[PDB]
Amino acid sequence: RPTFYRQELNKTIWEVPERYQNLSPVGSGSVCAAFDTKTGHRVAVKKLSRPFQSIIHAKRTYRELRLLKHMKHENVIGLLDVFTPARSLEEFNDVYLVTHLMGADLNNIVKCQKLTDDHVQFLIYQILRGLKYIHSADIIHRDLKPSNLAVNEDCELKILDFGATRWYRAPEIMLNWMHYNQTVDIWSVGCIMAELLTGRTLFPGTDHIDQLKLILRLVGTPGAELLKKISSESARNYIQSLAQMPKMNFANVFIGANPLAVDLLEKMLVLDSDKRITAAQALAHAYFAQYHDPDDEPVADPYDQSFESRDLLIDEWKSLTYDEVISFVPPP
Numbered sequence: 001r002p003t004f005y006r007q008e009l010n011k012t013i014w015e016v017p018e019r020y021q022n023l024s025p026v027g028s029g030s031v032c033a034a035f036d037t038k039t040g041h042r043v044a045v046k047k048l049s050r051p052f053q054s055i056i057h058a059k060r061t062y063r064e065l066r067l068l069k070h071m072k073h074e075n076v077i078g079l080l081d082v083f084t085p086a087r088s089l090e091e092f093n094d095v096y097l098v099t100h101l102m103g104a105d106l107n108n109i110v111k112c113q114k115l116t117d118d119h120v121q122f123l124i125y126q127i128l129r130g131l132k133y134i135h136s137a138d139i140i141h142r143d144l145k146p147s148n149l150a151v152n153e154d155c156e157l158k159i160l161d162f163g164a165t166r167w168y169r170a171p172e173i174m175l176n177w178m179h180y181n182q183t184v185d186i187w188s189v190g191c192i193m194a195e196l197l198t199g200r201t202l203f204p205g206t207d208h209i210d211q212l213k214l215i216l217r218l219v220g221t222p223g224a225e226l227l228k229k230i231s232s233e234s235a236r237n238y239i240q241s242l243a244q245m246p247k248m249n250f251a252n253v254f255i256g257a258n259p260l261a262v263d264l265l266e267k268m269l270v271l272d273s274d275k276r277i278t279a280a281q282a283l284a285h286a287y288f289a290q291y292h293d294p295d296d297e298p299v300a301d302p303y304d305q306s307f308e309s310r311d312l313l314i315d316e317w318k319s320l321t322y323d324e325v326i327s328f329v330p331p332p
């Protein structure tokens with residue numbers, strides 16, 4: 001066991017190994033940047049807020065730890081370390097996770113640099129590559145947005161989840177469909193891509209219903225083929241009295257853009273989730289001809305998420321979370 005030191009950072013107590021120094025808050029869990037003396041690199045340390053307060057908190061803590069231990073891909077957040085000051089299961093109450101610090105989020109980059117077409121190919125390529133991996137573990141992000149995309153000075157990107165969101169959300173989620181295929185994530189990529197291309201938020205909705213209104217103005221009101229799959233009688237009625245609205249031709253909307261980028265956006269921003277391109281299919285799209293390597297777009301090992309169906313006691317989730325802290329093995 002290492003030697004821990006304590007310190008208070010903005011009305012929070014932080015107890016971490018001496019390994020990590022120069023902690024400075026960046027987020028509120030809450031997150032500090034820090035300097036990892038063992039490598040010389042900068043890290044982000046997340047301290048879980050109240051990890052075992054309820055059964056539901058306890059399950060989310062275990063969820064995040066299990067997920068982060070599983071993710072081993074260049075374009076997805078990965079765990080460098082996980083630690084607790086606690087000397088035993090009965091003492092266990094705090095959880096800290098450590099990852100490589102990337103210097104900026106994509107939101108930051110989009111505001112005072114107009115990206116070139118080459119930049120858009122590389123940034124979206126990477127989000128797709130990391131998504132192919134996440135999806136191959138039967139995980140859905142569900143909140144992909146520029147603030148969840150950490151980017152370095154070489155514009156290398158990783159997907160994470162800090163935890164409006166609305167501007168990037170698939171319309172089925174905002175109408176609580178409850179099913180949700182993984183292409184809800186592809187909807188988000190289409191919104192991100194549009195905004196990388198134009199400099200402007202695609203669907204800057206003011207609230208929940210304005211969000212859907214703006215979405216339908218671009219993509220059109222549901223076509224017969226979509227309406228045929230709608231099981232809920234209310235939904236169909238809720239839909240049939242919004243404005244009878246045409247799909248816009250995206251070629252007309254994203255004026256200056258590479259026609260291959262317009263094509264790909266048409267294949268992402270389809271209302272019917274069944275007809276949206278998959279991350280794997282997208283990686284093969286000619287827009288990414290300069291980046292695609294089918295031998296280097298890997299998939300995840302199988303991910304057991306049977307815990308998701310289980311209704312356990314706090315201390316059960318807590319001993320499970322403790323087990324995973326102990327079995328952690330750092331990357332090379």
Ligand SMILES: CC(C)(C)c1cc(C(=O)N2CCNC(=O)CC2)c(NC(=O)Nc2cccc3ccccc23)s1
Nearest residue numbers: 044045046060063064077097098099141159160161162
């Ligand atoms: C991208 C992917 C793989 C779908 C993630 C899911 C979650 C997650 O927690 N879950 C998302 C799904 N929903 C929930 O129930 C929570 C679990 C992540 N968690 C984090 O990205 N955590 C962190 C965020 C910001 C800073 C960090 C610094 C060091 C370590 C981790 C950090 S990333």
Ligand SMILES: CCCCCCCCO[C@@H]1O[C@H](CO)[C@@H](O)[C@H](O)[C@H]1O
Nearest residue numbers: 171172177179180181271272273274
């Ligand atoms: C008024 C706005 C209408 C939004 C229509 C969203 C339809 C999304 O697409 C649907 O998603 C489901 C997965 O959630 C699938 O089961 C359906 O088969 C598919 O058609």
